[PDB]
């Protein structure tokens, strides 16, 4: 019964709320990675800042879904933001592997929401996902996979010199 609401299915409204929870969850996981790489016994500042920037990106993605919900006449419903799966992230390779899996999880949720929007015949929601989320997801997954290939090349996890070189030349 919002005066603006048109062609917006209740199931899509709910799925949008779940999606923005997941973006906040992803933001929090990257926050955790930032703090781990900033530890004095880890001390890879370029890596830390990479994850810090990703944390802000994911928060922005969540805010964009809140704005979207309101534009369509749906109602934002928030739930707890669950803490990350780990308290410590091992090393740059383990963290990047976790980041790749997180990005693929977020991507799968976006594709699932696109499929729901398709089934409910909601082209505005389809366009929004395609224009604002799906391409950035593919780019981010490609970036992280490329990093993982380089970290393996550099001899991670055992090769500390390799880890240092990555921090100084791949995320500088």
| Sites for Cl ion among residues 59-88 (CB under 5 A) | 77, 86-88
The window from 22-30, 52-60, 94-102, 155-163 that contacts Mg ion (CB under 5 A) reads 22-30
Q: To 10 degrees, the CA torsion angle through 54, 57, 58, 61?
A: -160
Secondary structure of residue 161 in the 3-state scheme: helix
- Window 18-37: residues binding Fe ion (CB under 5 A): 23
Tell me the per-residue interface mask from 122 to 161 with its own copies, x by CB under 8 A, - otherwise: -xx-xxxxxx--xx--xx-xx--xxxxxx-xxxx---xxx
Q: Please report whether residue 3 would count as binding Cl ion according to CB under 5 A.
A: no
**Whole-Å CA distances, 160 to 38, 86, 124, 151:** 17, 22, 49, 11
Say whether residue 114 binds Fe ion (CB under 5 A).
no
Distance CA 20, CA 27 (A): 10
Which residue in the set 13, 122, 140, 163 belongs to the binding site for Fe ion (CB under 5 A)? 140
Distance separating alpha carbons of residues 93 and 90, to the nearest angstrom? 8
> Is 61 marked within a binding site?
yes
The encoded tokens of residue 83 equal 């803490």
Closer by beta carbon to its own copies, 11 or else 101: 101
In this structure, what token pair is assigned to residue 124? 């505005």
Chain centre to alpha carbon of residue 84: 13
Decide whether 61 or 72 has the Cβ nearer to Fe ion: 61
Based on the number of CB atoms within 10 Å of its own CB, is 171 exposed (0-12), middle (13-18) or buried (19 or more)?
Answer: middle
Q: Pick the closer one to Cl ion by CB: 87 or 158.
A: 87
Is 140 annotated as contributing to ligand binding? yes
| 115 part of the interface to its own copies, by CB under 8 A | yes
Task: List residues forming the annotated binding site.
Answer: 23, 58, 61, 103, 137, 140
Task: List residues forming the annotated binding site for Fe cation.
Answer: 23, 58, 61, 103, 137, 140
Binding site for Mg ion (CB under 5 A): 10, 18, 22, 135
């Amino acid at each position: 019964v919002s005066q603006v609401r048109q062609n917006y299915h209740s199931d899509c409204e709910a799925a949008v709320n779940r999606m923005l929870n997941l973006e906040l969850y992803a933001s929090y996981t990257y926050s955790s990675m930032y703090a781990f790489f900033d530890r004095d016994d880890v001390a890879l500042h370029n890596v830390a800042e990479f994850f810090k920037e990703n944390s802000h990106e994911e928060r922005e993605h969540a805010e964009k879904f809140m704005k979207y919900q309101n534009k369509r006449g749906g109602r934002v419903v928030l739930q707890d933001i669950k803490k990350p799966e780990r308290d410590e992230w091992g090393n740059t390779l383990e963290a990047m592997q976790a980041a790749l899996q997180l990005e693929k999880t977020v991507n799968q949720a976006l594709l699932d929401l696109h499929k729901l929007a398709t089934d409910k015949v909601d082209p505005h929601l389809c366009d929004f996902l395609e224009s604002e989320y799906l391409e950035e997801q593919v780019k981010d997954i490609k970036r992280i996979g490329d990093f993982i290939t380089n970290l393996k090349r550099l001899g991670l996890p055992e090769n500390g010199m390799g880890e240092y070189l990555f921090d100084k030349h791949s995320v500088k």
